[PDB]
DNA sequence: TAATAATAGTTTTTAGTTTATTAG
DNA sequence: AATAAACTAAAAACTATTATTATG
């Protein structure tokens, strides 16, 4: 998509709100540049020493100071923000502010495509303010629909906060209503877990195909990729090692015949096949007619079973599949939705065999369906070929006369686990919550990749980017478990014993430490 | 795992096997057998000797006692020494160059084949022999017995059936010994592993840890990697390829490799310690969090094959007891265990659900869900997927119904390994024909065209009755 | 002075390179 | 200008394998 943002700073410094201001400031940029978001920002900086106004209407806009129109971020203008804004001394007005704001958003929608607006102001609100020009600036806020995220340093403010206050909750009842009130928050706190961490989203595209139910009967169907293992956007550039691009950076091969300096080309290779104590000559114009034909994107379903069948266990492949109806097929729609209710009243699965498109590989799929209030569809998981099913035998475990755990042994389990139970237990308000989402935790990989991205940037001779310890926060459960579990943990440790382990793995060698 | 199964092919020659012919489809069995075998694995051995011919190719030179292949890896030369005699044509040269029923002693087979199984120089798990006759022909009989015994003692298995079809001619081998059709080639492109993947520490708290038996189960199969033959000697070249200095002339090395993101403003050049050090978080093992109901799934969050985690007794004595106590628990708790998991250094972790795997012993004790648990991969906020938004229209008590009549009127067992892959298949055919030089040898459909196409009728379709649309909503 | 130590090269996975359909 | 069949390095173990310091 595409948003448009205005940003807005707070004598100024009065903790000191300045500071908080600028650090989210600076995350909120950081991450910008980080997600790489196709969305320009501008920046206006009210109550900064000097009268610099980009238009001076009639010298009425006091302190008012656009350092950045609405442009691309980037790590310069990361670094810009930084370094050069530094608190002002005299208070300004907010109406300057807003004015100024409006007046930059509608310079600049004109060229530059927006599917979204909004506004980020931040202000201490300890600076004089008159509120007098509330027409206008509520047209302009109903017309370029800048989407306020306003922010307080903050529950007994002093009376220049007070009237900002009331008059900030006005105008957003006056244009928003209460998400207007909701979008107020602490600049600590709220705003600091707001940004902390981002997430990433690589979109899929749909899979649009026709389920054939039976020999004909076909349903039109499109298919998202729902969950899937994500992967970084960004591979590394081998650059040169001091003209840092690709110059002397190159991937080729020699293929040298195992002699005696003598070597091969391209053309020169054949593809064999290690057949057992020797290897068959083949070639791909020879895999072109000797491989099997598929029939384009079909989704050939060609079996039903009982769910009691199939297990969690044995659920392979690597993808997701929300098995949609297509586009605005009411007649599919309906009788898809007829399907999967059957399905699930019977708890009957389907068999799916699955190809994405013409030179995809045949899939044996499990089909069953996914049931909410907001989206309701078929679940696609990719079932196995008998050669994945791969067999060990193992020893049985309860019959263990020589490992045989006691009764005390036990009742410390059971103490252990009722102790270090992760989620809310289902009380009569069925509150069965987890404690501890780890859905909703994105990869600690990236944002450590980001930080130490940022590290390298802002300062080049930083040499080691150290670890968030708030993604240990973010890796680690709440004490109060591991509290309870403790004396649980003293009970199992006084009631298993162990013997030494090996494999110390060490430092890469053992400098000045 | 050291030592394999040796299995070693015996067919008589009495000239009563030459009359179609017990001689003809034995070949036959034993040419499906090898094929499997060599599609199968390498490690294993196998041999053909014969007797009761007029020549005696043999070590110690018995009579009527010739060997064709020694025990060795399965090869194509072998296959096409087969081939020459499956035909009629082929069994006449065959008994020409061979020889016609003669006389022999089952004492002087048994001691060839013995000597046989012992020339080996390798660990072999398993011995057993594979013989061919119409009918028991048997002195002799006692000497043969007494040989047998011996053998059997020594650690030699036995496998025979009578080639007439029923349950009539086993009279004079009822004792000596300890159903070819399933070895009719009617399983191809096995793949046999016996490797165990890498041992850990479960770290469940922050002093004590446990040796666990981390066990792959139903990872993907993929066709073997091909190799790069020369054209005309059709041997694999040397493949020597690293980055040199182009633009201007020489050679790179790897500490010139500089890693750099082009972001926003400037290049971030670093090199590869940086990366590598990125990727390291903590020690490789399986921190664990806690406890959290089985029902507290998306019950479709799978992203990676799961993994089965089983106590190994080698590094802490506690992994058993414990793990034999939680599974005991796993019958009164739901509860799955939260793990940080690491396979080795320098890796992300991930959040992992031990889901309670209890073993279920069957009738014949088949290990279904081993003692353990399997790794449950769960996914990150990055890993999910935004959806637009569909609530448009529900179904109705009649099309719900009419749609249960047609389903469940088709049901279907699932048998988990009724299934294989077409690609691979294919492949090892394809393979097979022209390792012997043959033509196309066949197409087998592995069910992936469904098989309702022709059954539908059979079900009694009736969703084309109702078209609950005017306009044919299947156009 | 007449043992067990670190020890190669196995396969086996596992993560990082390449050509078809959306955007103009 | 995205996803994915289809190659391409790379990192444990299950096997043989050798230097201890056994002693004048």
Same mark, same amino acid.
């Given at each position: ?28 940029? =950081?991450?910008?540049?980080?997600? @790489? ?7 206006? *900086?009210? #109550?900064? $020493? %000097?009268? !610099? ?106 009376? =220049?906060?007070?009237?900002?206050? @009331? ?7 006056? *244009?928003? #209503?209460? $998400? %207007?009130? !909701? ?331 | ?475």
């Amino acid at each position: 998509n595409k948003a448009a943002v205005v940003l807005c700073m707070d004598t100024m410094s009065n903790e000191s709100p300045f500071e908080q201001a600028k650090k989210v400031i600076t995350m909120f940029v =950081q991450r910008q540049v980080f997600a @790489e978001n196709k969305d320009e920002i501008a920046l206006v *900086l009210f #109550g900064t $020493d %000097g009268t !610099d106004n980009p238009l001076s209407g009639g010298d009425q806009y006091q302190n008012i100071t656009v350092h950045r129109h609405l442009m691309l971020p980037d790590f310069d203008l990361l670094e810009d923000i930084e370094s050069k804004i530094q608190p002002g001394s005299q208070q300004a007005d907010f109406l300057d502010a807003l004015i100024v704001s409006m007046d930059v958003i509608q310079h600049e929608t004109i060229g530059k495509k927006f599917e979204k607006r909004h506004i980020e102001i931040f202000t201490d609100l300890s600076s004089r303010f008159s509120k007098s020009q509330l027409d206008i600036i509520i047209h302009s806020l109903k017309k370029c629909d800048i989407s306020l995220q306003f922010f307080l340093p903050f529950k007994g403010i002093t009376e =220049q906060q007070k009237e900002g206050l @009331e008059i900030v909750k006005m105008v957003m009842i006056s *244009l928003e #209503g209460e $998400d %207007g009130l !909701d979008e107020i928050y602490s600049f600590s706190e709220s705003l600091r877990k707001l940004c902390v961490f981002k997430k990433i989203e690589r979109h899929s595209i749909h899979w649009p195909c026709r389920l054939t139910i039976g020999s004909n009967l076909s349903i039109r169907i499109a298919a998202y990729k729902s969950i899937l293992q994500e992967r970084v956007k960004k591979t590394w550039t081998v650059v040169d090692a001091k003209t840092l691009k690709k110059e002397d950076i190159q991937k080729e091969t020699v293929y040298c015949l195992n002699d005696d300096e003598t070597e091969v080309l391209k053309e020169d290779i054949i593809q064999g096949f290690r057949y057992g104590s020797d290897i068959v000559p083949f070639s791909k114009v020879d895999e072109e007619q000797m491989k099997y034909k598929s029939e384009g994107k079909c989704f050939s379903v060609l079996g039903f079973c009982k769910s009691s069948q199939v297990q969690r266990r044995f659920f392979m492949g690597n993808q997701v599949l929300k098995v949609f109806a297509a586009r605005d097929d009411e007649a599919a729609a309906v009788a898809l939705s007829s399907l999967i209710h059957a399905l699930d009243d019977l708890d009957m699965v389907a068999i799916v065999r699955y190809a994405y498109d013409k030179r995809a590989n045949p899939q044996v799929g499990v089909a069953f369906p996914h049931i909410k209030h907001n989206y309701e569809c078929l679940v696609y998981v990719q079932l196995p070929f008998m050669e994945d099913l791969r067999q060990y035998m193992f020893s049985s475990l309860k019959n263990s006369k020589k490992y045989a755990p006691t009764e005390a042994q036990l009742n410390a389990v059971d103490a252990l686990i009722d102790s270090m139970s992760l989620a809310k237990k289902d009380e009569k308000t069925d509150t069965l919550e987890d404690l501890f989402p780890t859905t909703k935790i994105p990869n600690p990989r990236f944002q450590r990749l980001f930080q130490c991205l940022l590290h390298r940037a802002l300062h080049p001779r930083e040499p080691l980017p150290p670890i968030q310890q708030h993604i240990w926060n973010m890796l680690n459960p709440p004490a109060e478990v591991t509290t309870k579990s403790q004396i649980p943990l003293s009970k199992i440790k006084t009631l298993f014993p162990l013997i030494e382990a090996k494999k110390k793995d060490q430092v890469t060698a053992q400098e000045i430490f | 795992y050291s030592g394999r199964d040796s299995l070693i092919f015996l067919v008589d020659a009495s000239k009563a096997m030459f009359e179609l012919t017990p001689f003809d489809m034995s070949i036959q069995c034993i040419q499906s057998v090898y094929i499997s075998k060599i599609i199968s694995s390498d490690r294993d051995l196998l041999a053909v000797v014969f007797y009761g011919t007029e020549k005696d190719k043999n070590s110690v030179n018995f009579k009527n006692i010739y060997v064709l292949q020694e025990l060795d890896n399965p090869g194509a030369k072998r296959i096409l020494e087969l081939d020459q005699f499956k035909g009629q044509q082929g069994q006449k040269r065959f008994q020409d160059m061979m020889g016609h029923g003669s006389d022999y002693s089952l004492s002087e087979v048994l001691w060839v084949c013995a000597n046989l199984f012992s020339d080996v120089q390798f660990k072999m798990s398993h011995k057993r022999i594979m013989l061919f006759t119409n009918e028991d022909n048997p002195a002799k009989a006692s000497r043969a017995r007494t040989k047998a015994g011996d053998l059997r003692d020594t650690g030699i298995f036995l496998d025979l059936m009578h080639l007439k079809k029923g349950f009539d001619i086993s009279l004079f081998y009822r004792d000596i010994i300890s159903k070819l059709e399933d070895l009719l080639r009617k399983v191809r492109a096995k793949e046999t592993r016996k490797r165990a993947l890498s041992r850990l520490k479960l770290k469940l708290n922050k002093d004590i840890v446990i040796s666990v038996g981390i066990y792959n189960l139903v990872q993907k199969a993929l066709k073997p990697p091909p190799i790069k033959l020369y054209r005309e000697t059709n041997e694999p070249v040397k493949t020597k390829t690293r980055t040199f200095n182009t633009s201007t002339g020489g050679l790179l090395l790897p500490s010139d490799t500089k890693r750099s993101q082009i972001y926003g403003s400037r290049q971030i050049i670093l090199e590869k310690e940086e990366t590598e050090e990125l990727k390291r978080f903590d020690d490789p093992g399986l921190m664990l969090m806690g406890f959290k109901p089985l029902v507290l799934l998306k019950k479709h969050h799978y992203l990676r094959p799961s993994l089965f985690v089983y106590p190994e007794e080698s590094l802490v004595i506690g992994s058993s007891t414990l793990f034999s106590a939680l599974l005991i628990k796993c019958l009164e708790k739901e509860v799955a265990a939260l793990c940080r998991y690491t396979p080795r250094r320098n890796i992300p972790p991930y959040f992992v659900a031990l889901v309670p795997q209890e073993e279920e012993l069957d009738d014949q004790k088949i290990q279904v869900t081993p003692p353990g648990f399997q790794l449950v991969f769960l996914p990150f906020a990055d890993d999910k997927r935004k959806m637009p938004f569909t609530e448009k229209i529900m179904a109705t008590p009649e099309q719900v119904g009419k749609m249960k009549a047609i389903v469940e009127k088709l049901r279907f067992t699932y048998r988990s390994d009724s299934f294989e892959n077409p690609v691979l298949q294919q492949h090892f055919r394809n393979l097979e024909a022209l390792a012997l030089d043959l033509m196309e040898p066949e197409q087998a459909v592995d069910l992936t065209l469904p098989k309702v196409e022709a059954m539908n009728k059979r079900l009694g379709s009736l969703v084309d009755e109702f078209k609950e649309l005017v306009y044919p909503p299947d156009y």
